[PDB]
From a paper:
Capsids are protein shells that surround and protect the viral genome. Tailed bacteriophages, as well as herpesviruses, use Major Capsid Proteins of the conserved HK97 fold. MCP adopts the expected HK97 fold. The HK97 fold has two globular domains: the rectangular P-domain (peripheral domain; residues 107–186, and 326–373) and the triangle-shaped A-domain (axial domain; residues 192–320, and 384–391).
We extracted capsid particles from the raw images and performed single particle reconstruction imposing icosahedral symmetry. The resolution of the reconstruction is 2.8 or 3.1 Å according to gold standard 0.143 or 0.5 Fourier Shell Correlation (FSC) criteria. The capsid exhibits T = 7 (laevo) symmetry, which is surprising for a capsid of this size. The larger size of the T = 7 capsid is due to much larger and flatter capsomers than found in other Caudoviruses. We observe conformational heterogeneity among the seven copies of MCP in the asymmetric unit that is restricted to the E-loop and N-arm. A series of lassos topologically tether subunits together to stabilize the capsid. In this manner, the E-loop acts as a lasso to topologically attach to the next subunit within the capsomer. Thus, the elbows form twofold flaps on the capsid exterior to stabilize the twofold and quasi-twofold axes, while the T-loop forms tongue-in-groove interactions on the capsid interior to stabilize the threefold and quasi-threefold axes. The decoration protein forms a unique cage to lock the mature capsid in place.
Residue numbers in the entry:
A (entry chain A): 155 to 307
B (entry chain F): 104 to 409
C (entry chain N): 2 to 146
D (entry chain F): 1 to 52
E (entry chain A): 53 to 103
Write the structure that this text describes.
Amino acid sequence: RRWLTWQVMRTGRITIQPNDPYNPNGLKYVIDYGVTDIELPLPQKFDAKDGNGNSAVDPIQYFRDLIKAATYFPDRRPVAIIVGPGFDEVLADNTFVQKYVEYEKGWVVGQNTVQPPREVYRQAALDIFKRYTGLEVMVYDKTYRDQDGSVKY
Amino acid sequence: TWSPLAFKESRVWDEKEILYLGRLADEVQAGVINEQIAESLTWLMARMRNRRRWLTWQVMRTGRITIQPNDPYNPNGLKYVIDYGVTDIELPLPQKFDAKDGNGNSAVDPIQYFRDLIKAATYFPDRRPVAIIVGPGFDEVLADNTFVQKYVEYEKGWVVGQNTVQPPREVYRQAALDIFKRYTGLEVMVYDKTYRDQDGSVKYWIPVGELIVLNQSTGPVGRFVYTAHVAGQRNGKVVYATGPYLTVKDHLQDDPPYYAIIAGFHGLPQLSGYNTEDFSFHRFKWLKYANNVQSYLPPFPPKVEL
Amino acid sequence: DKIQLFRTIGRVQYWERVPRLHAYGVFALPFPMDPDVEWGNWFAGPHPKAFLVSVHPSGPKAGHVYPTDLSDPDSVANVIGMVLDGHDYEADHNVTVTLRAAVPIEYVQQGIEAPPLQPDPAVLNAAPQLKLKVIKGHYFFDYTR
Amino acid sequence: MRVPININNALARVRDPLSIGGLKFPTTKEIQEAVAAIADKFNQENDLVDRF
Amino acid sequence: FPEDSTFASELELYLLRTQDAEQTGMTFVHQVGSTSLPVEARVAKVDLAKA
């Protein structure tokens, strides 16, 4: 039941082939559900960091751009995001999100402080993400072991 | 002088469809015309209200009722150019509030601009602004201005090189209305109401990079006047009536029996009062304040067509 | 393939009837229809449409109406009126032809390959010899005279 | 102008009474009906200039 | 999603959509001593779909 369920959740497409685990009878199903535009486009991701040290895409602005472009598409604005394990470590090395963290604590780097390490600089990366995008974040770091490789999420 | 305009129209139902139509699912004993005339009767009331608001808005927008022959809902092909006396309806502004000359700095301080208009009308009391009515994208113009920004920084203590990293555009725009209201003293009303174009997308009534400037009062500017129309007789004497009328002609007993409805009225808008010294009218003026305001706006759904 | 997505089945369009001038007057007489004419593609469509009919003056089909061949001068000379918002051609073969009315030019097409709600330029071009008078974008016709 | 139909009587009518598939007999099924009304929300009336 | 039971072998959905005509179309212009003019024709429509 969970395999068919995750097959819809991941692709919107139940595909069963003959050369397949636990299909000895050699059957054929290609069940296309009506899921429209399952992948959001993002050609430079968040940790591209083109140039010297500055990145390219603001996730606080990107996920606010999506809410703005669906003010009259009420079935289409985002409400929550469910992420794997390493989402805070992308936000803390972003050089756009960092200026949001510096703003809410008064961290001008030239005065007032030397720049801190990534401890509190990542510890507040969730709440500043949750307050400025307004959406919920759930972490699902649950794991499985592959047939051949190491442990995957 | 002043003299009104006339407009009326009609619709007729012939003899086939009066007793040859029921519903489409079930079977009905020929009474659906009573349902469909009652809607078409209410629709002609919604025409005369729609024609009034077209004439009224045509004054508010240009001060010029212009009716050309090749025009929607002018089959009769009539010429009208009705010039009112609205003086200098377009405020001059050769560079917008979002010109951004050079690196990142703009060229026009808009808070100084409207305050420059208030100072230049200290002894022209019918000519200082009291309120502004804008479309949706007015704060997005103000927040990216580099003059207004220095007003936002001043009321909170934000020197950028010290004391703070420069804030995001959330707080930088959330406080943009009240600093415009405190330093110009005037009122801002938002009219974000929309309509759908014929070929184009959804548009706003007050256009996107444009606004209106109300002078000395925010009360009613003008008047819409209904003039007399010939009603029937009562005791051999002709009786008159004003406003929209709706006459019913039932020819349901002749050899092709039919049925008609006629609606119309007589009227025209009229401005209230001009300046007695030099005959000038300036209560509302239009300002094209920016250009790329649609880039700050969400898109609209296309019209679903079965 | 075990799930079908939504696809539409029914397509019903309900237009209104062809408008005409109230004050000009009506005069209409029922005529028999020509069986040689395929009347299906003349009453095809939900759109408001009028079209001109001629009449056979003699022969074995005399007194029967057929749509006007604008390329034939004899069928132009025998026009008798218009059919307004066509009837059940399948249950009955006797159409009511309007001989006197006042109809806008957007509702009269002769060719089947003519778009609805648009003026037919072949009708406007032959309107002198079709006894049509175009005033304010409306056809005025009376075939009692 | 609305089309003169019945809502409930047309959903119960556009469905085949005499249809068999590749299986030579009628199958069990289950039917849910839904009704939508389509209107342009973004074509609104200029009620501003009544007060002017 | 939770789990559900039906005791059937197929499920079908029907959707009926309606689209009325709008009350638009300003008004025709007149002169006082003449006759009126007729109003254009509108259109309403319905569709229906199946899954």
